[PDB]
């Protein structure tokens, strides 16, 4: 509601080339296009992040992944972000996004991370993921032990 | 002719100073 960056006068590209000799540059390729050695890159934060809403003044938020395979899965990661400061992930506008300030979902600056307890993990009716290799508590990864706790 | 072409390898002295096996592409946030 206060000023805007509407004008984008012009954009361009800038590709810098290594002035490699044409004999080696034609040997670098024409050997780099064999199917034996094709380059492969992996996303650093390789993750399948979703967003589960938490109503105002709410207790434990339950989630449930249906039956599926867990072949190469390696670990969870979770924090909570305020909804007033998270875009709707949809293309174009979202007129219900009226905060401009850091965006933890994008920038990577989380602060509500210090509010968690009892992150219990259960497989199918087998409610202990660590299970046999027990922690000090047997069932759930307890965090932020309350006023109690001997 | 069937001569075989090796690689030039900027030289630290007589030795061509090839280098070690650093074709590593593992980042893996984990």
């Amino acid at each position: 509601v206060d000023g805007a960056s509407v004008r984008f006068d012009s954009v361009n590209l800038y590709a810098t080339f290594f002035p490699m000799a044409h004999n080696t540059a034609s040997t670098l390729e024409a050997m780099l296009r064999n199917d034996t050695h094709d380059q492969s890159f992996n996303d650093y934060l390789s993750a399948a992040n979703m967003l589960y809403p938490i109503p105002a003044k709410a207790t434990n938020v339950p989630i449930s992944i249906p039956s599926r395979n867990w072949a190469a899965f390696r670990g969870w990661s979770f924090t909570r972000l305020k909804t007033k400061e998270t875009p709707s992930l949809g293309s174009g506008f979202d007129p219900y996004f009226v905060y401009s300030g850091s965006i933890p979902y994008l920038d990577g600056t989380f602060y509500l991370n210090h509010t968690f307890k009892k992150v219990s993990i259960m497989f199918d009716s087998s409610v202990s993921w660590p299970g046999n290799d027990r922690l000090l508590t047997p069932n759930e990864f307890e965090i932020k032990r309350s006023v109690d706790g001997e | 002719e069937d001569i075989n072409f090796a690689s030039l390898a900027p030289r630290h002295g007589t030795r061509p100073f090839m280098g070690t096996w650093n074709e590593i592409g593992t980042s893996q946030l984990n």
Binding site: T27, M31, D35 | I3
Partner: protein, 190 residues
């Protein structure tokens, strides 16, 4: 004690690690003879037992002879290896000629694993070209696991006669989806 005409153990693929994962008699292609007379039942039994024979012959003909069903790792020899032809490159420039011309004042524009074969784009000032022959295969053969096309050849359904007859150390434990043959004990946090 068993039927001499048992249902075959279909074998399933874990494409990711490339190796098989278990078996379980085909419960999808069974017929329903429970409302047929003594003769149709026999002809059904015959159709069933012809299948079994085809499966055994197929296996002999195609499957690789193994001492262990579903090995945890396949040797490089037994895995289909893609071997492309050598890749030839036609080097465009002449290394010495362009040095001589450039030094003159002319301003141009526009281990041993290689073969510098002369053919005696091009350039007017020199008639020398040079082919370059390169190996395009892997540095080392891949052992790993087997792919999709090879799987359907190695693992045909296996007819199991008199299935569990004594010697619990002789049962085919590869049929168990979560059996780890290396430690020989069923694993899983579940």
């Amino acid at each position: 004690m068993s039927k001499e005409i048992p249902t075959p153990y279909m074998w399933s693929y874990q494409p990711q690690m490339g190796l098989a994962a278990g078996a379980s008699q085909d419960y999808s292609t069974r017929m329903n003879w429970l409302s047929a007379g003594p003769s149709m039942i026999s002809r059904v039994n015959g159709v069933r037992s012809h299948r079994n024979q085809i499966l055994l012959e197929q296996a002999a003909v195609t499957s690789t002879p193994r001492a262990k069903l579903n090995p945890r790792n396949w040797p490089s020899t037994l895995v289909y290896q893609e071997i492309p032809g050598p890749t030839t490159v036609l080097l465009p420039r002449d290394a010495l000629a362009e040095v001589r011309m450039t030094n003159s004042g002319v301003q141009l524009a526009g281990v041993s694993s290689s073969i510098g074969l002369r053919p005696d784009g091009r350039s007017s000032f020199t008639p020398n070209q040079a082919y370059l022959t390169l190996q395009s295969s892997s540095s080392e053969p891949r052992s790993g696991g087997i792919g999709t096309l090879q799987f359907v050849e190695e693992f045909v359904p296996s007819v199991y006669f008199n299935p569990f007859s004594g010697s619990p150390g002789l049962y085919p434990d590869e049929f168990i989806p979560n059996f780890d043959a290396v430690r020989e004990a069923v694993d899983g946090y579940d």
